[PDB]
């Protein structure tokens, strides 16, 4: 259900991000974005609502708004498990202006379906409001995301926030002593020097996709999570990207077979990306929510709110012991 839509959404979003900056690293969490938008759709009506759900890639003929929110509730209940060597947490929050009246139904649905906390914020003191939201996110992402919110309109009525923190250890860790500075080719004739970690004589799921000119390998983490790596041949990235479809991912995972690998080299790195998703969302059909015709009357009972901006911040750390990934999404909503 939700998984199918999420994979479709993930790849659709990916292609748009690449179009915007074809040379830069792409780092995001479909789940964080989908969750924040589904949370927002809780208070949307008519076309505003329809566009969001359709934008999230849900087949409204095969699934109903009720089912959708239930999927997100179960998803939240399931994910929050930070213990068994694998730490995974996700939280939702809404910072609403002091004295702004919200429908009881919205607040209740938000708490039970999105486990959303609600915080009365004095948006007039922009500097104070920023820190509160940023500190909440900083706290939630164990210190990784520090500046999700850079600025706010003094006309801000509320901000929906979602954050996901992930920390796992490799099932087969890399020995730091085997990490050596080596070349990472940006292009066929240009490269940078980076710490290249290595593993020798390991048996892992592998698949050489001759049809797509790429190699797929899976490195499991201790827990119920894995990292799928897709290595396109030299100059085949765009060809692989053009084929990033749900059926492709499924085919890859179904084609994986255990194979003895003599040597595996993977760079150790820490990268981050900052995004203003307005352009991307509009391209995905989510439009009315941003306009004067925004119908978010399900939040306060009147059409007096419109989305001004949706931001996303992402951080990825890959090292010898494991991986740390942090993502956060914020939906700034102003007066209309």
């Amino acid at each position: 259900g939700l998984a199918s839509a999420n994979v479709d959404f993930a790849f659709s979003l990916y292609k748009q991000l690449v179009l915007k900056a074809p040379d830069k690293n792409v780092i995001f969490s479909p789940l964080s974005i989908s969750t924040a938008l589904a949370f927002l759709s809780l208070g949307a009506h008519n076309t505003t609502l329809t566009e969001i759900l359709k934008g999230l890639k849900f087949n409204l003929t095969e699934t109903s708004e009720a089912e959708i929110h239930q999927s997100f509730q179960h998803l939240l209940r399931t994910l929050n498990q930070s213990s068994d060597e694998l730490q995974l947490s996700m939280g939702n929050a809404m910072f609403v202006k002091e004295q702004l009246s919200l429908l009881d139904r919205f607040t209740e649905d938000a708490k039970r379906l999105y486990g959303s906390e609600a915080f009365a914020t004095d948006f007039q003191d922009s500097a104070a409001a920023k820190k509160l939201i940023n500190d909440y996110v900083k706290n939630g992402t164990r210190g990784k995301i520090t500046d999700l919110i850079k600025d706010l309109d003094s006309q801000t009525m509320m901000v929906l926030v979602n954050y996901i923190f992930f920390k796992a250890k490799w099932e087969m860790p890399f020995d730091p002593q085997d990490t050596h500075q080596s070349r990472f080719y940006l292009s066929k004739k240009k490269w940078v020097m980076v710490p290249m970690m290595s593993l020798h004589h390991l048996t892992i799921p592998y698949f050489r996709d001759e049809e797509l000119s790429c190699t797929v390998v899976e490195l499991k983490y201790t827990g119920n999570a894995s990292a799928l790596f897709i290595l396109p041949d030299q100059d085949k990235m765009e060809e692989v990207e053009a084929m990033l479809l749900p059926e492709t991912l499924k085919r890859w995972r179904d084609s994986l077979e255990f194979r003895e690998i003599g040597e595996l080299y993977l760079p150790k790195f820490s990268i981050s990306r900052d995004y203003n998703l307005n352009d991307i969302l509009l391209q995905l059909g989510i439009e009315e929510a941003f306009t004067s015709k925004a119908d978010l009357s399900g939040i306060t009972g009147a059409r007096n709110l419109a989305v001004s901006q949706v931001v996303h911040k992402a951080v990825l750390d890959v090292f010898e012991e494991g991986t740390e990934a942090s993502r956060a999404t914020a939906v700034k909503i102003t007066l209309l």
């Binding site: 199918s4 780092i27 080596s182 940006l186 190699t215 993977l266 991986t323």
Partner: protein
Amino acid sequence: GTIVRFNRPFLMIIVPTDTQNIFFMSKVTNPKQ
């Protein structure tokens, strides 16, 4: 013996082991940012 060397642009997708879903996704074109 086969050798897999990630010394050029690659994609990394973190997915649950027993579910067709995507938690995190990245294209690393330059690990130095």
